[PDB]
Amino acid sequence: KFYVREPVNAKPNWLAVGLSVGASVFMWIYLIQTHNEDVLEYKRRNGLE
Amino acid sequence: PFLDIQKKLGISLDRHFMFLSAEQPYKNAARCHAFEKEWIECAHGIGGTRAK
Amino acid sequence: MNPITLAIIYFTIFLGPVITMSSTNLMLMWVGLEFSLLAIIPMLINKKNPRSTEAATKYFVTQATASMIILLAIVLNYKQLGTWMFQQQTNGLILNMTLMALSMKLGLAPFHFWLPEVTQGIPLHMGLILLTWQKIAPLSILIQIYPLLNSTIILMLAITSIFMGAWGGLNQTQMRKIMAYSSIAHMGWMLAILPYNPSLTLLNLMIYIILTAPMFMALMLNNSMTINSISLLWNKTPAMLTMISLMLLSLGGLPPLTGFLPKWIIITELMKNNCLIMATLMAMMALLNLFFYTRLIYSTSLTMFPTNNNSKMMTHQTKTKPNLMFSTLAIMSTMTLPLAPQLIT
Amino acid sequence: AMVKRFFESYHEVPDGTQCHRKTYITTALGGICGIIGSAYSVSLNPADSTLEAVARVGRYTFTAAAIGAMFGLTTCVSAQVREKPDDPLNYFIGGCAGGLTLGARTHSYGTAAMGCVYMGTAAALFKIGKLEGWELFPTPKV
Amino acid sequence: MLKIILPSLMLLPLTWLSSPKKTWTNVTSYSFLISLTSLTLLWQTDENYKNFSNMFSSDPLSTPLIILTAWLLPLMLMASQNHLKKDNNVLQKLYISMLISLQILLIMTFSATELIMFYILFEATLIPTLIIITRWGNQTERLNAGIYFLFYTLIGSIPLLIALILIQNHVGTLNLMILSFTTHTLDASWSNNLLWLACMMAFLIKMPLYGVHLWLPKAHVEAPIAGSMILAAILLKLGSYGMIRISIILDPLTKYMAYPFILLSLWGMIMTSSICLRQTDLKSLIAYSSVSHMALVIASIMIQTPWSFMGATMLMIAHGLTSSLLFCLANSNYERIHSRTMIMARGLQMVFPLMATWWLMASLANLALPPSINLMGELFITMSLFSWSNFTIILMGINIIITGMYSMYMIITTQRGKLTNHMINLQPSHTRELTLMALHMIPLILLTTSPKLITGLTM
Amino acid sequence: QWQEDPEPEDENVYAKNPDFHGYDSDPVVDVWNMRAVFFFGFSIVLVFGTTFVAYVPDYRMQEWARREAERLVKYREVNGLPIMESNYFDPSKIQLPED
Amino acid sequence: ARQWQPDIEWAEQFSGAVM
Amino acid sequence: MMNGRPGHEPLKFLPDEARSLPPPKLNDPRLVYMGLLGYCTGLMDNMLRMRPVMRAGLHRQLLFVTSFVFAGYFYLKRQNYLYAVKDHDMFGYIKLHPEDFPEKEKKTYAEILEPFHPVR
Amino acid sequence: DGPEKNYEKTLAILQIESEKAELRLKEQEVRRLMRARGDGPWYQFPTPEKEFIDHSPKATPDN
Amino acid sequence: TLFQLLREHWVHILVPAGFVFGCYLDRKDDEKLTAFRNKSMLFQRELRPNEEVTWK
Ligand SMILES: CCCCCCCCCCCCO[C@@H]1O[C@H](CO)[C@@H](O[C@H]2O[C@H](CO)[C@@H](O)[C@H](O)[C@H]2O)[C@H](O)[C@H]1O
Ligand SMILES: CCCCCCCCCCCCO[C@@H]1O[C@H](CO)[C@@H](O[C@H]2O[C@H](CO)[C@@H](O)[C@H](O)[C@H]2O)[C@H](O)[C@H]1O
Numbered sequence A: 001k002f003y004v005r006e007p008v009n010a011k012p013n014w015l016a017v018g019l020s021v022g023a024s025v026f027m028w029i030y031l032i033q034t035h036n037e038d039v040l041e042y043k044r045r046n047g048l049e
Numbered sequence B: 001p002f003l004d005i006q007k008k009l010g011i012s013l014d015r016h017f018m019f020l021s022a023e024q025p026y027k028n029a030a031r032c033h034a035f036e037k038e039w040i041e042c043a044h045g046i047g048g049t050r051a052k
Numbered sequence C: 001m002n003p004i005t006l007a008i009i010y011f012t013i014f015l016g017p018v019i020t021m022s023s024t025n026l027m028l029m030w031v032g033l034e035f036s037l038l039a040i041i042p043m044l045i046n047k048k049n050p051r052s053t054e055a056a057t058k059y060f061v062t063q064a065t066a067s068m069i070i071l072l073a074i075v076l077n078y079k080q081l082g083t084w085m086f087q088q089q090t091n092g093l094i095l096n097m098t099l100m101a102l103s104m105k106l107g108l109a110p111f112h113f114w115l116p117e118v119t120q121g122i123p124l125h126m127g128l129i130l131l132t133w134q135k136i137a138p139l140s141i142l143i144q145i146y147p148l149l150n151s152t153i154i155l156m157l158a159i160t161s162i163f164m165g166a167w168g169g170l171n172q173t174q175m176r177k178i179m180a181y182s183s184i185a186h187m188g189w190m191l192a193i194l195p196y197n198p199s200l201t202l203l204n205l206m207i208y209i210i211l212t213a214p215m216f217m218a219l220m221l222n223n224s225m226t227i228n229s230i231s232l233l234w235n236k237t238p239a240m241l242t243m244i245s246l247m248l249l250s251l252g253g254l255p256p257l258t259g260f261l262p263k264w265i266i267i268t269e270l271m272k273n274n275c276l277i278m279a280t281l282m283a284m285m286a287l288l289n290l291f292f293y294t295r296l297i298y299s300t301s302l303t304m305f306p307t308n309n310n311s312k313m314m315t316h317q318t319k320t321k322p323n324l325m326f327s328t329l330a331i332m333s334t335m336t337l338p339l340a341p342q343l344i345t
Numbered sequence D: 001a002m003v004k005r006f007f008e009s010y011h012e013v014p015d016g017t018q019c020h021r022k023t024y025i026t027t028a029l030g031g032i033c034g035i036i037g038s039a040y041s042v043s044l045n046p047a048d049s050t051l052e053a054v055a056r057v058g059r060y061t062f063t064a065a066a067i068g069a070m071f072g073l074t075t076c077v078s079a080q081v082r083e084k085p086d087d088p089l090n091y092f093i094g095g096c097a098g099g100l101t102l103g104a105r106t107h108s109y110g111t112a113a114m115g116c117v118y119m120g121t122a123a124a125l126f127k128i129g130k131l132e133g134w135e136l137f138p139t140p141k142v
Numbered sequence E: 001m002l003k004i005i006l007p008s009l010m011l012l013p014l015t016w017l018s019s020p021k022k023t024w025t026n027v028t029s030y031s032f033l034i035s036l037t038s039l040t041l042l043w044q045t046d047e048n049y050k051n052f053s054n055m056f057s058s059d060p061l062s063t064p065l066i067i068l069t070a071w072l073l074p075l076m077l078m079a080s081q082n083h084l085k086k087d088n089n090v091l092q093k094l095y096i097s098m099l100i101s102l103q104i105l106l107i108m109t110f111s112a113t114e115l116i117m118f119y120i121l122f123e124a125t126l127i128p129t130l131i132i133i134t135r136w137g138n139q140t141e142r143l144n145a146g147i148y149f150l151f152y153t154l155i156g157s158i159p160l161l162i163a164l165i166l167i168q169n170h171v172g173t174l175n176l177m178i179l180s181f182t183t184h185t186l187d188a189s190w191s192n193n194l195l196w197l198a199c200m201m202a203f204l205i206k207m208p209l210y211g212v213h214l215w216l217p218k219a220h221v222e223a224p225i226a227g228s229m230i231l232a233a234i235l236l237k238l239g240s241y242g243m244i245r246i247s248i249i250l251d252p253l254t255k256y257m258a259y260p261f262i263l264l265s266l267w268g269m270i271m272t273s274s275i276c277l278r279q280t281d282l283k284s285l286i287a288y289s290s291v292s293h294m295a296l297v298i299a300s301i302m303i304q305t306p307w308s309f310m311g312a313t314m315l316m317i318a319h320g321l322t323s324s325l326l327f328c329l330a331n332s333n334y335e336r337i338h339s340r341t342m343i344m345a346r347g348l349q350m351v352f353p354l355m356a357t358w359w360l361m362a363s364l365a366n367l368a369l370p371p372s373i374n375l376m377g378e379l380f381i382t383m384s385l386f387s388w389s390n391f392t393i394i395l396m397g398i399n400i401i402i403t404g405m406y407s408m409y410m411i412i413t414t415q416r417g418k419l420t421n422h423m424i425n426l427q428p429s430h431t432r433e434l435t436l437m438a439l440h441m442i443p444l445i446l447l448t449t450s451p452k453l454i455t456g457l458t459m
Numbered sequence F: 001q002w003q004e005d006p007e008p009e010d011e012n013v014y015a016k017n018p019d020f021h022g023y024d025s026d027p028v029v030d031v032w033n034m035r036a037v038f039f040f041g042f043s044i045v046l047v048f049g050t051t052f053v054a055y056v057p058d059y060r061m062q063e064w065a066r067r068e069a070e071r072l073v074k075y076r077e078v079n080g081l082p083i084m085e086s087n088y089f090d091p092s093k094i095q096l097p098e099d
Numbered sequence G: 001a002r003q004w005q006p007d008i009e010w011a012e013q014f015s016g017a018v019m
Numbered sequence H: 001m002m003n004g005r006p007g008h009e010p011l012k013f014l015p016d017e018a019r020s021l022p023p024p025k026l027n028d029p030r031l032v033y034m035g036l037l038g039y040c041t042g043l044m045d046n047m048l049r050m051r052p053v054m055r056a057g058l059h060r061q062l063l064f065v066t067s068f069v070f071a072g073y074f075y076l077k078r079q080n081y082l083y084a085v086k087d088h089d090m091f092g093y094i095k096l097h098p099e100d101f102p103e104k105e106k107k108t109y110a111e112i113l114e115p116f117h118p119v120r
Numbered sequence I: 001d002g003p004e005k006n007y008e009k010t011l012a013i014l015q016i017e018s019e020k021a022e023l024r025l026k027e028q029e030v031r032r033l034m035r036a037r038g039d040g041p042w043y044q045f046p047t048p049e050k051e052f053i054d055h056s057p058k059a060t061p062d063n
Numbered sequence J: 001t002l003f004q005l006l007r008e009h010w011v012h013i014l015v016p017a018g019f020v021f022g023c024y025l026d027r028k029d030d031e032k033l034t035a036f037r038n039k040s041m042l043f044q045r046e047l048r049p050n051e052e053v054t055w056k
């Protein structure tokens, strides 16, 4: 123990960490998936391959 | 309107009593109903500049 | 205020502009402006001292008078055309009093004199609402009737606001008065372009808001009301010195900061319409703003003013502010010029 | 209104001719600017009595009318003597004469000197604008 | 240019992620390596100028200015180390980042292909420059120097912005190559005469033109040494470089529009060089010497001849190295006795014999001793002006006499006579200080060996 | 008076480290900063940069142009043509105004 | 000499009601 | 200017006709710069809270980077669509009005008499 | 590389910049005509909505 | 090798990696500008036997 007063940030906010990694990992997956469908629809509509 | 929320939701909070030709209680036509109906209908779909 | 009062009053502050922006009927637009005036007064006077009472009273009598003139125009147009919206056939004098009254609501010069006084008399977080959220409803009305507005009155209001915003901010030692004159100058730019390109009015409004919001948060961090108070930042919260300096230079429109974009694009569009003389005058006098921002940068981050002994006790204390909204707005208000094509069209 | 037409009469005839009419027009314009300025001055910086307010209105209006008279006269005489109707330099000389008048009325060589340069440049640019078809308040086009 | 700009941008993380004891050694070394890479721009085996993309190009005018910019960054870092050694670690890193920022901005400025891009980068440089002057200048007058510098530039730059928008609205582009090929004669209207001035004033204030030069003596006396180096060497050359790029579209009005600016420069170069005879402040003397030299650059660009453009290009580079050297030499005495008064330290050849040699060569460069590129630029400018009007040689002749007088006056006053022996704090020259002088003077000699590299666009 | 530090005293840099090179108060940091400047500045940039510039071939096509000039001077002289003509453009390719 | 920094007399020119 | 155009849906962020356009690359330089700004926002936030600038809150830093890229991608799609519509309208209008936009037959420099202005 | 690469990349740069220049001038011409005549997709300023006109038989006949 | 050593000397890859990445971006700029490769008046020719492009 060092601080005479207990810090507010003594240990991670485990809920906040989990939500943050969940939000970022979900957004990366949704971004990549949405980009995949956006490519296929573009090719379908323009008759490409 | 600046934000077309009413059009997007398909509701009418204030679009339906905007001019003389609008719906009146007990079907009491306002003065100049037929002239305003003709002016609004001529102008429809062509924009304000041409309508003028 | 207890929670029920806060919820109702803040909800009405939010509601008014939403009504104004969504209304087809001009009477409902006026109703929206009425909600804004009524709901903001108790917040202006919340702290209850003679200065806040003066500020709330001056705000009320100006805003209520302007609201009556706006209502007169709406009623006169209803008499002329039997409708509740301004048309191409609306009498030009009716449109000119609408412009006059809305510009008085916005604090554009020469209807500006109230705004530096009211901003000085209220808490910083209320100045923030006054200079950002409260601009949206009157501007939203103007944008709807932009083809109908008189370019002569607009440019005269616009150049007057830029001139008096500049000379006004040059004499100030109070931060709340500097922000008020900064508001007036930027409103002058927003208005000048409205009859030509209302999208560029909105671009300037957005960039002004995301510059002004974090500037107010930076003042709020230590409650710095004067130049001498903000000059103690180097000792109280030195980490803010970089972002305050860049936000001030961005407000002044110095390239390559984001705040150069609104002045640059509005000049481009004004000169596409042969408005060369006004654009030149506007751009030249906007340099005077950069002067008083620079003097402010001189006293915060580029020199170190004398500090005091009690400030050492402040360095022992931990802070919980600013929130992370400050960093987001601070970065996007200064470092987004590379993304300029995505902001204008 | 006809009042607008009275001001379009300044350009009905080339510069350097009808110098009497052009001096009345610019004297009238100067007086109007003095009345507008006086109105804002007394309203926002009220005088100690009504006779001082009225005295200040007269001081501003006559001084502004004097500047407009000297500008209009000197510009026309300069074009008449030099036989150059379309020269912006004639307007620079007139604007400098107006700037010197302002300094003479306010007892200031710095205002005379600074007045001469700023008013000369503004008047010269006005003539260039008239020749090259610049618009002060263009209506929207694009 | 991306293979030059990207490594320059990586100097910023390198500065901030280095250990406190490795920052200077790291950033200086890679800054030297980036100067090496910029020499690739000199591989020009044809007469088609390098267009790397729509955005960046390099031709025989920008290439020397880009390389000189790249070379100055290491030199400025070495110049700054001693007077920053009392600043804490974060303040040292902040200073280095300001120096890197100018290097990045200036390289982009000289390689921009489009005029509003040039304008944005041209204006961006004011921010790091102002910060350097006002945060690390020594005296209370540094704040006034910042105001003059910023607002002399800005008032001229606003008309430039209007002219650039106006040209683009009329032509549809501000790309320089297309403006060159599609240029058409201008009519000699009052409106076009104002257009000419709007296009020229910001560049002329930046040179600076005599009459609007007061910002430069103020800025130099108050700036730290690395600020003086970049300001004299590169920042003044933005005006000359701007004038050469934009004058291609201004014909034929430059034939009569140039007269007041040739007159101010040719007469002004005598006024500012004669000031150097009675200047008590050594930094101010070197600064007024620059105004006199840049007056020649203004005159030769105004007359627009193949010789005049070539003489201006050489003088731009030669003055860049020479003036930066003189500021560094003056700063070495100031760091010992902390005064800029020229007459204070005296007889210094007695105690700093090798530094006195660097002083002599810098002075010989400054008075344009042949066959230096300093003389070559001034000579071809003199030939072109004589062709423009044979009476120009009278004013040239007076300036040549005066330039020798003050150049040798500075050497005699500070290096010779009796040593001011109360100055017991005259520590021997640093290895760093003597190295810094050599890094200026070797390129000057090497460029004198191969003067084809700095002839510019016309030869 | 206010509370302010006195001005620091003049220091002789060579008193503690008589091998000071000007770069750093730490002796080991000092000598390596000196070596990096001399190695990268002089051994690398000034020597190899000078070499690279020296061997840039036909800089701005000056060697080709003299070679091309001699070819044309040779050709234009055996065939009796003028060495250089007044008109760059053949007049047949130009259509002047009638007036 | 030490770098100049604002003293009391310099800071007092911003202590007035106006500039 | 374009708001009242035919087939204009109100408050539609991405109209279905925008799905014919090629989507932006996920390593588009504008999207890479957006993610860099999000990274700067995280570092600036650490500085303002007196935290280790690079070390503290990597979860918070990652969310800042991902949010900027995520939002920027969809906003970039909308901006691509608006510019495409502008060109679709401009060219379509040009075709309906061939009398206002004639093809101007340009002359060669063999016929054009530009004035010569001697430099001397 | 040989001089061909830089030479031909310049032509490619020239073609793009030229075509952007003519597209920039043409847009201003289009905007001018569309705003003055109101006959295009742009500058279509609103007019009253006709779907809210009441077309029912009224209380009186002559309406 | 060693966390104390690597934590000090890893920064030596930044500028070299900026150069290599800067070179990579410059080659991508060449690829976007091939619209006149082997099509100019001055240089266009017939392709050599096993040649796909005149420059890359
Ligand atoms: C601010 C935004 C978020 C909050 C949203 C708004 C909803 C808030 C819900 C909690 C509100 C309850 O708040 C509560 O209000 C009542 C009003 O009857 C007050 O109570 C009031 O009536 C009771 C009667 O017994 C007494 O306490 C007293 O006469 C008076 O104060 C309480 O002192 C306050 O605690
Ligand atoms: C286009 C180029 C962009 C240029 C970017 C501009 C960068 C920012 C410039 C403003 C500088 C911020 O201002 C600078 O703030 C830092 C803290 O961050 C201060 O830093 C210094 O003082 C503070 C206390 O005051 C100490 O805690 C700190 O360790 C020390 O280094 C500097 O003394 C101040 O001058």
Ligand SMILES: CCCCCCCCCCCCO[C@@H]1O[C@H](CO)[C@@H](O[C@H]2O[C@H](CO)[C@@H](O)[C@H](O)[C@H]2O)[C@H](O)[C@H]1O
Pocket: D006, D007, D008, D009, D010, D011, D025, D026, D029, D067, D068, D071, D094, D095, D098, D099, D119, D120, D122, D123, D126
């Ligand atoms: C003392 C120097 C002052 C420097 C400021 C500039 C001075 C120049 C302006 C005065 C010149 C003469 O005055 C100017 O000409 C006449 C007056 O009859 C009017 O001239 C103009 O009138 C109207 C503008 O409303 C135009 O549509 C009209 O085409 C034109 O003739 C202007 O309203 C007036 O500005």
Ligand SMILES: CCCCCCCCCCCCO[C@@H]1O[C@H](CO)[C@@H](O[C@H]2O[C@H](CO)[C@@H](O)[C@H](O)[C@H]2O)[C@H](O)[C@H]1O
Pocket: D100, D101, D103, D104, D105, D106, D107, D108, D109, D112
């Ligand atoms: C073509 C050139 C024509 C030249 C004439 C036009 C230029 C006009 C210049 C006006 C100069 C100002 O006019 C001058 O103001 C000074 C101010 O000290 C006043 O001077 C007088 O009063 C002041 C105080 O009021 C005393 O200090 C002074 O000793 C006394 O001479 C006078 O009013 C007048 O002498």
Ligand SMILES: CCCCCCCCCCCCO[C@@H]1O[C@H](CO)[C@@H](O[C@H]2O[C@H](CO)[C@@H](O)[C@H](O)[C@H]2O)[C@H](O)[C@H]1O
Pocket: C274, C276, C280, D132, D133, D134, D135, E159, E162, E163, E166, E170, E191, E192, E194, E195, E198
């Ligand atoms: C220091 C203060 C001065 C700042 C200088 C500002 C930049 C330089 C100003 C140059 C003046 C512009 O000069 C003016 O340009 C405009 C716009 O193209 C053109 O002028 C014309 O434009 C269009 C035609 O294109 C006409 O409809 C218009 O009525 C007329 O003004 C002429 O070319 C010239 O009259």
Ligand SMILES: CCCCCCCCCCCCO[C@@H]1O[C@H](CO)[C@@H](O[C@H]2O[C@H](CO)[C@@H](O)[C@H](O)[C@H]2O)[C@H](O)[C@H]1O
Pocket: F048, F051, F052
């Ligand atoms: C800035 C620093 C620059 C560093 C410079 C280092 C350059 C090194 C020079 C290497 C020169 C020798 O280069 C070598 O020469 C031979 C000559 O046999 C040539 O080789 C070519 O011609 C020879 C002639 O016999 C054939 O046999 C051979 O099959 C063919 O490839 C090439 O040119 C190259 O393969």
